[PDB]
Symmetry: C4
Subunit: 388 residues, 4 copies
């Protein structure tokens, strides 16, 4: 009907309640479920769906041997109904590619998939389910994107891309689209040294994305965008409570405009909600590998380089695997504020579970509450040995 505008603010978060859960690997043991990875959730004005990058095979199927690789001609962006598994018979294909992003603007939805060789990949922008715009590689080394949903304000929806090295300086750019057409684009600015896999949300005409520095830096990069003026800035989260993985241990003071040193050439997609005292950071529990997941209330994290934990909540125990995590919100829900949500990818199989030749994932999703609810941990459930 009409373009949506970020008119409200974030509700206060005093705890988190379960929103959705897949149980995909448990069910996939005896069903026609698709091997996926790199998921997310995204809302429309009438329903919210689950999203993922398919591998073009069922888990129990023979072609699942070798699904440890990321880029192939047999991947695609698919969507399915909330808390149901990525079934072969109930899934809908958005576009063909091995990297992606998607978002609705009040009128219709825009989806972007990237495909191709390393020497020269390319992005195609779709809108109202028709292919509208195309963009070829600029720095000729794996053109990539968010891996989670974008946000729009009155028709304009910014998106972040990177093209170039993963263990050194790259070429990041913020593009501004309106009905699938490029309005403008500008290169990265600010003090952030490496950008990758941005997780974004919005409130009161502003967009905040917490991203990943894969080069060096256990603290996380941040990008604030102004959808009306079409401008931005970047920096790091000051707080000493580090959130990348892998990472060293938490210190007494942190860094605001420089990567905190300790581990190289590695990271993980993550997110956070930056709102003064109402600030919460998410992270794995293990400093060495992707296991466990926890949420932490760290007042004034982004601006205070000494801030420490006030309250917290456990999502997945440290004996249980996790993976990626990102942000989303239901911009079309009734209320006076925006209720914040997030998802956590639960990876099974290789590399850590190598008696199996595949790699796949599960999903758990939570949203905020204004009460102080009790906590419980939410693992995937599957017994790898039933697959031997």
């Amino acid at each position: 009907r009409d373009f949506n505008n970020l008119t409200k603010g974030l509700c206060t978060i005093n705890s988190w309640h379960i929103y959705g859960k897949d149980n995909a690997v448990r069910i996939g043991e005896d069903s026609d479920v698709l091997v996926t990875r790199e998921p997310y959730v995204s809302c429309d004005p009438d329903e919210c769906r689950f999203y993922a990058l398919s591998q073009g095979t069922t888990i129990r199927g023979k072609h699942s041997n070798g699904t440890i690789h990321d880029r192939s001609q047999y991947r695609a962006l698919i969507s399915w109904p909330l808390s149901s598994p990525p079934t072969v018979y109930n899934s809908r294909v958005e576009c063909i590619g091995w990297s992606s992003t998607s978002c609705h603007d009040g009128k219709t939805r825009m989806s972007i998939c990237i495909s191709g060789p390393n020497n020269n990949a390319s992005a195609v922008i779709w809108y109202n389910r028709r292919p509208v715009t195309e963009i070829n590689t600029w720095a000729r080394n794996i053109l990539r994107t968010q891996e989670s949903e974008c946000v729009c304000h009155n028709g304009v929806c910014p998106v972040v891309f990177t093209d170039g090295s993963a263990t050194g300086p790259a070429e990041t750019r913020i593009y501004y689209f309106k009905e699938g057409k490029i309005l403008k684009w500008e290169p990265l600015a600010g003090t952030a040294k490496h950008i990758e896999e941005c997780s974004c949300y919005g409130e009161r005409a502003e967009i905040t994305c917490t991203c990943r520095d894969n080069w060096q830096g256990s603290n996380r990069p941040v990008i604030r965008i102004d959808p009306v003026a079409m401008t931005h800035t970047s920096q790091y989260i000051c707080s000493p409570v580090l959130t990348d993985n892998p990472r060293p241990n938490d210190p007494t003071v942190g860094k605001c405009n420089d990567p905190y040193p300790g581990n190289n050439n590695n990271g993980v997609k993550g997110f956070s909600y930056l709102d003064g005292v109402n600030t919460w950071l998410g992270r794995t529990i293990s400093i060495a590998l992707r296991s466990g997941y926890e949420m932490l209330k760290v007042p004034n994290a982004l601006t205070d380089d000494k801030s420490k934990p006030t309250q917290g909540q456990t999502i997945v125990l440290n004996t249980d695997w996790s993976g990626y995590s990102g942000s989303f919100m239901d911009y079309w829900a009734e209320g006076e504020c925006y209720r914040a949500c997030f998802y956590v990818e639960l990876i099974r199989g290789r590399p850590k579970e190598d008696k199996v030749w595949w790699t796949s994932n599960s999903i758990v999703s939570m949203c905020s509450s204004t009460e102080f609810l009790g906590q419980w941990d939410w693992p995937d459930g599957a017994k790898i040995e039933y697959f031997l």
Copy 2:
């Protein structure tokens, strides 16, 4: 369009005709059917669906070993099309939890799921498919609810919860919701000593729920609610025709405001239609275990402590298993009265059938007729030995 109001009365019941049947366990032998339990039926203005608490696995699947437990992170409230099985590809998820209730109000539908540990569980109320309200545990010992549908009158829909011991005094409360928001709540009143798993229906601006006393008492508790004034009372069904399971034998006189003694720490979810001479009680045939099912016309049951059977009808033979049973009606059907219906859960597997490692169920459903129709028995059908 507009809120629904309990404007009619109950039609006269002279017999029951089949409404719906699943045949889930028969079909699940060679299909992708989900292991479920604790079912019910619920109507919308345009279609009536089947409901159940999934276990997150298919019957023939490996993860079905151990589905004898009730509370787990892998259960969910699902719905599917009438007289079809709970298939993996045709099911819709309402919310995440191990206890529940749901009902439409004329405009939209409200669903409630409860999840968490025993020390501290919590309920989340959803409306129009978005999470609106949250409630944490009050007495810190398994917060639980109806296990069947609620009833609404002009926007207000009462719901009964219990939190605390199952073999002693607990904390029951009636909550009044309007569009997912808590209007009010009040503690139990009247002479009923223990409340659990209420089965409710409505006619002429009043709501009657026949429940379960798991502490002591083979006779059943009753709760009458006034949706307009937001008040209630409780008591027991006077009649000597006992209906809980397990239970002792029928006596000559019964108890109106006190639990009839005989068996402890056990019961089963049940229901009844209380309407003077037009009164019918349902019950298993075996006094010791959940087998067989029969309907009995006992005039003035609730107020007469000597009332005895006038007419009856067999639903499931005593050589056949049954389980839970509850009430529902199609508030949007054409006519001058409300045609009363009920469902019976048919459990297969453990505990009684232990050559199998799972536990699942089937459904049969009937509604009333004004004629005196012939009777037939309706078992599940499956041969356990085809699963060995």
Copy 3:
């Protein structure tokens, strides 16, 4: 929108073209297809669907052993999309029973299912998907109905039932319904001695049903109904070209008001289009068993007891099995006349193919053309030995 009226006449038939085909048994070898029997086709204002009486099991499933029986608590009336198989995931249940009929009236659809023991069965009438009317057994010996679709004229839809013996005198009645309510009913009249499984169609405010005499009589009974006056008559098709199965050989002259003698206690559901010179009778090729199928132009069959074949067309070869057959037409298609159609059930398995423990069927359907098209035979396709 508005009630439909039989306003047109039959187009001239000069040949038949394929309309639809299932290929169910071929596909069911490696799919979740349901064991069915007693099928038919029925149109709505917007789509035409396939219909059948399910057995509550998949073909490859264990519970298919013993599906040679007809009456059981696990059967149901289901419908699915045209030329697709009766799949477990794509089927819709109309009502519970082992005998049936259904038809749309311009506004909504009425469906009727019969269930129960032999001593006392009962029919429930549904309308707009809600159970409206009930009727108990009158002569206490297997109450049964059409096994194909009914026809309506301005809201009124007659239906034929039988209750009593199959090898002697019974109790037939024509019921007249309007929105699921009984308008009237009257007993059989005319010179027909035994009625069973009527196949009906309509044009110019009249309804003709060709039925089955299971007692004695290789020639077929006929019932003409006047939907406006609510009256009828019966008789036999005069022509010497006999069409029941089993049957003796064709003679030189036939019988108009008396069963032609030759074979007892046996028959098969069939049909015909009676329209003067534009008359066509259908029948199996073998006089002893259900094999092959052919259509024959026999001018003035119903009134001329000497009429013989003018033109013909082969549908299924005599080396291929067939079974039941019935009539249907698309009352909502554009044109100035009614294009006539029919279906043939193709049975596989027991009794003739006994290396398998089940019994199931396939469907082929044809409609008329005004040209003289070429012919081809349409078998089921499946190789029974792939099931061993």
Copy 4:
């Protein structure tokens, strides 16, 4: 709503981007996917679907042994959702036959299927999903059609048929339909000697179809139609860059009105976009067999018998199988021109891969871009040995 008119022109093509991909054979290894062949794509005003001629069996199913044959009573025209596999549970049947074509006109869609024996086949035309017109064989030797979609202009949609010999002179005719009714038909004209499997598109009130000469001729026949006047002409593509398969090698000069000699009794369905300098021809890489696929910019191909390659792009490598290819466009997309698309069938199994007893295919589809995007090759993916 209203009839569609070819009002725009072709956008300029500077490269091709992926549109859709099936991955059917990879997935069919562990799923209920249907054995198909002879596919295509076709758009509606609201969605574009995939099309194919089914064989009436699943790939892993027993009835897949022998699917090397083309004409049988068990084939059908089916359609399914874009980039999803032809699943047994998600497919929709259009009509019954072993040869076909289909297209939407702005209001509704017309589909045509051909069935029957070689002595006398026949076509039935369907519209708005009801059978409207019938046509019997004229030259009594396999009546056949396009095997891809038709194009319409203000209600009129021409279609090309052939009936008669494949290795000598036949009887081709162009039919003009309007709402399923034959407006007119006329025999082939111009200098083309043999016509088969036409691939058509349209822009600015004209229809161009590049077809197949199976008799003699490695260069391709062309038919230009005037939808308003209902007339046409034929000829060959002049250019020396030959595109049929099998074929001899490319010469220095070509033939405009005569079949270029070299190989007999063989060909393959193909297409091309003829637009002056903006001209592109598609073809397999191997001159002997169906392997590899490439697109070539050959300015003024149709009129210049010396034209040679200016630019090109690889679609499938020569070590990978291909098959048929055809044209389609989204006539209802926003813009000022028509964005051109095409599909390539990827055949697996017999005849070249004979360790398997079946024959099936996969799909890849691309559309044009105005940028110069990078290229990648798109194979089917499946490992035949996982089927042994």
